[PDB]
């Protein structure tokens, strides 16, 4: 009846140059977000943006959909989905070795970040840096 939705992005730490997964917000009937402090703001209604809606529709018209797959863990689903993206020719096969690393990193929560020092957005390259 009421569900929980989580969102994680690929960012870098102020401690050392690296890449890792950090959550950004949480959804139980409302949006809750956190800043650089590591503290979550008071829940509120979520407000969308124009380009967000346009590109969600655009990519969803041409999105691969896999329903009721028999797996047990993220690694297997990742392998199967990248095989699916190869299958429908959505990505080149010479990309999989990086993409596989891209989706296999430590998914850590807010409590370590104060020891980590904070994160900022960064972009993947072809090299892996």
């Amino acid at each position: 009846h009421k569900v929980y939705v989580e969102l994680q992005e690929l960012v870098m730490d102020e401690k050392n140059q690296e890449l890792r997964w950090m959550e950004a917000a949480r959804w139980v009937q409302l949006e809750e977000n956190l800043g650089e402090n590591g503290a979550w703001g008071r829940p509120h209604l979520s407000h969308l943006t124009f380009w967000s809606l346009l590109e969600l529709r655009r990519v969803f018209t041409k999105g691969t959909v896999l329903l009721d797959l028999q797996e047990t863990s993220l690694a297997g689903v990742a392998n199967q989905l990248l095989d699916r993206f190869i299958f429908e020719d959505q990505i080149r096969p010479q990309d999989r070795e990086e993409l596989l690393r891209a989706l296999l990193l430590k998914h850590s929560h807010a409590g370590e970040l104060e020891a980590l020092g904070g994160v900022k957005p960064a972009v993947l390259t072809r090299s892996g840096d």
Partner: protein, 466 residues
Amino acid sequence: HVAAHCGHHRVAKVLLDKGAKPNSRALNGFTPLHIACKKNHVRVMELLLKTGASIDAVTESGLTPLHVASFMGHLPIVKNLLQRGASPNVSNVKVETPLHMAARAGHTEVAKYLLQNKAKVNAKAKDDQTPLHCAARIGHTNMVKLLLENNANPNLATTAGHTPLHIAAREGHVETVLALLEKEASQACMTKKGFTPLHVAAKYGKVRVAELLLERDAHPNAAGKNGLTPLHVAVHHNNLDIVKLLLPRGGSPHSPAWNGYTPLHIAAKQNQVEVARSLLQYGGSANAESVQGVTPLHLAAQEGHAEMVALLLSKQANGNLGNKSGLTPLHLVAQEGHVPVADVLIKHGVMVDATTRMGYTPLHVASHYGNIKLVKFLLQHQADVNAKTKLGYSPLHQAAQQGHTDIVTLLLKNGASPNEVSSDGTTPLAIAKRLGYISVTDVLKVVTDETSFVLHRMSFPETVDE
């Protein structure tokens, strides 16, 4: 005894009716009934029992004739002895029934015959081994199914914590595990040491059973008292063929032990190639904090093998990372004195004059080690020869406390000042003297100027704990 060993009932009749004693025993403690039970003579056994040789009897080893008949594989002797009055419930000097003594070899028909009459298959041996435990070491398939006919539980385990699943994986009989799967043995079977069914497969390299273990949909995440996973036990004694397939089978990427130990640095410690490649693909981070704070990069650099300095570049990490002590990769390289690794590292762009938390530099540390090579290389790296510690200690004081006159001479030759007083008032000469090092004192005292003060604290570099 010789009549029952050579199978002659004709002279046995004469020896009985003329005069004899069935109770007479040899050095083993064996009755003639025992010998007849061993050598499968039936008419001699019938004559002896018609005389009145006792069914119950104790050899000096501790066996019974039922135990001998079970261990020798003789069907008609078992038939006659169990018809004419016997007890399967009997204990030896090690508590063992003839069911345990039969399932030690797996004679099928004696097992059916003993099970037909009243014998408790749910039983404990001397170490409390069920007959499933002794049957697991055989590799015999339908012998298991006959015990499961009288529903011996796989829940039952010995004192040591071993289960019939544990012994079946120990000996590695795969069809035995196929028979066991339908019996639904739990996958939470944990000994006192915390072992899993995956752990013995990781140790002994019995790996065909991995698909069998996933037939019941095994979960790799499993930690005992020491928090160890099948991957840590697999890397401790490497059988890589299982791990390469476990990694797509939902492997645990960054699980630490109770020591906070990741598989990365234990993989590096015993140098090998393919493990690093697989962990890298599956997300292995060499920056994980231990309880000390040491990273897999640092523990890899302590051993400093040839191929590690190649692969570690692909991994992205802080080139020099301090510990609680402040130990930087350079520190470890100086500790082990690996010139190759130190070279690779300098090429990577590490800090030449890195200092510890107390104020020790890689020169100080190298002088304590006494490695002249670790001082020439460092000279090439341009590390200052007069770096003083936070307590006034210089590479001279340090070479004097270590007693490495060679290193002290190499430092002095390269312009190192010998007249630097530490926070305790002792120069390199003062030290060399107080330590009774003469070979060193000869050079140091002349190079050093008169001691800054009239006056014994030494100087040892920090090191990571076990």
